[PDB]
DNA sequence: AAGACTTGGAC
DNA sequence: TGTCCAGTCT
């Protein structure tokens, strides 16, 4: 069992820290900058922490704005750690809202010794035209860290912070960003695009889904991109993202047993395949529940049939049972629950069941 | 496999 | 308010 991440900023490392800045700047106020970061430490959670180190530091160093930031550069290679240096873009968030040019180089210096992901979301979240300019800039920079920075600190959803409801509205703002990137060659961007796109899929799939079917993908950086891009919708057993991801058959019989259940009765799939081919196939089966979540709407999940080869005018049937309970990771809501097959990607019946209260 | 599991914050 | 993140494990 690890230690907690707020323990990251620990009395241990704020001594680091004062340490380091005294190097820099020997007239530091190590003493009252310890003072200042340690007070009720110990209640203080780990962004909370990160943010302490910047407002212990700008409580005891009597420099100005550009001043500081000087010494905050020489800081910035002295950090063990790109985690601990949240606290410099931090700095820039606080302190650098009167100055917006000197800032946005800050960060962009910043973003290459950890991350100013969280602390460009400020000025996107109250200057967002002029934030969104310097960042369409910055997906153009030779460093793949300032790249990464203009996909990952537009995201829609950013894990630990607030989401950017007028992006996460709007895919149109920041699509060109994305299309400066969609080829890069360095893979921490490319994970930052994808992660970006998946959050897009959350609420304009159709928007991504005719996007990347606007992609040249045999570039293997854009290929990779995708697959990453798409891997919600593809667990959803989305037929667009199948087909960009890569059958002669009918059905018969198809039917899920009992059409009404509750929770923790078990279910059965059954169906018979026949081919209209006159030669065997290869087949991949699957089928899909739109579980009913907490809104009430539907998610859905693909699970795994069977892959075989069906001979030609052949016929396989096929069963499955599944046990309907909730488990530590899917938490049943009642309702209707449509359930697809699907072959070789594309949806070939529908039956349902209903999950009782 | 599909599910258990991993930080802790947003919703 | 269980799920997700962005995978590792079986």
Same mark, same amino acid.
């Given at each position: 069992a690890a230690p907690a991440l707020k323990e990251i900023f620990n009395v241990?490392?704020?001594?680091?820290?004062?340490?380091?800045?005294?190097?820099?700047?020997?007239?530091?106020?190590?003493?009252?900058?310890?003072?200042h970061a340690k007070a009720g430490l110990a209640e203080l959670s780990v962004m909370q922490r990160m943010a302490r180190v910047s407002e212990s530091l700008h409580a005891v160093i009597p420099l100005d704005y550009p001043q500081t930031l000087t010494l905050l550069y020489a800081l910035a290679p002295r950090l063990n750690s790109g985690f601990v240096s949240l606290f410099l873009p931090h700095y820039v968030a606080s302190y650098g809202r009167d100055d917006f040019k000197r800032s946005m180089a800050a960060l962009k210096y910043f973003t290459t010794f950890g991350? %100013? =992901?969280?602390? $460009?979301? @400020?000025?996107?979240?109250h200057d967002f035209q002029r934030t969104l300019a310097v960042m369409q800039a910055? +997906?153009?920079?030779?460093?793949?860290?300032?790249?990464?920075?203009?996909?990952?600190?537009?995201?829609?959803?950013?894990?630990?912070?607030?989401?950017?409801?007028?992006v996460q509205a709007d895919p149109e703002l920041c699509a060109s960003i994305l299309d400066h990137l969609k080829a890069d060659s360095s893979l921490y961007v490319r994970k930052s695009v994808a992660n970006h796109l998946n959050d897009i899929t959350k609420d304009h799939p159709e928007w991504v889904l005719s996007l990347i079917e606007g992609w040249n993908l045999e570039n293997p950086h854009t290929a990779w991109i995708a697959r990453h891009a798409l891997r919600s919708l593809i667990k959803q057993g989305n037929?667009?993202?199948?087909?960009?991801?890569? %059958? =002669?058959?009918? $059905?018969? @019989?198809?039917?899920?047993?009992?059409?009404?259940?509750?929770?923790?009765?078990?279910?059965?799939? +059954?169906?018979?395949?026949?081919?209209?081919?006159?030669?065997?196939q290869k087949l991949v089966v699957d089928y899909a529940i739109d579980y009913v979540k907490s809104t009430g709407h539907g998610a859905a999940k693909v699970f795994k049939l069977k892959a075989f080869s069906l001979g030609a005018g052949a016929q396989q049937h096929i069963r499955r049972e599944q046990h309907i309970r909730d488990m530590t990771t899917r938490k049943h809501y009642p309702g209707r629950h449509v359930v697809h097959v699907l072959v070789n990607g594309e949806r070939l019946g529908s039956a349902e069941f209903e999950l009782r209260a």
């Open positions: 241990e490392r704020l001594q680091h820290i004062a340490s380091e800045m005294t190097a820099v700047y020997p007239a530091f106020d190590a003493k009252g900058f310890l003072k991350s %100013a =992901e969280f602390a $460009i979301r @400020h000025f996107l979240l910055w +997906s153009q920079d030779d460093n793949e860290h300032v790249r990464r920075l203009a996909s990952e600190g537009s995201r829609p959803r950013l894990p630990w912070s607030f989401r950017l409801a007028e037929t667009r993202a199948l087909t960009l991801m890569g %059958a =002669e058959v009918k $059905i018969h @019989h198809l039917m899920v047993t009992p059409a009404v259940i509750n929770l923790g009765e078990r279910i059965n799939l +059954s169906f018979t395949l026949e081919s209209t081919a006159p030669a065997p």
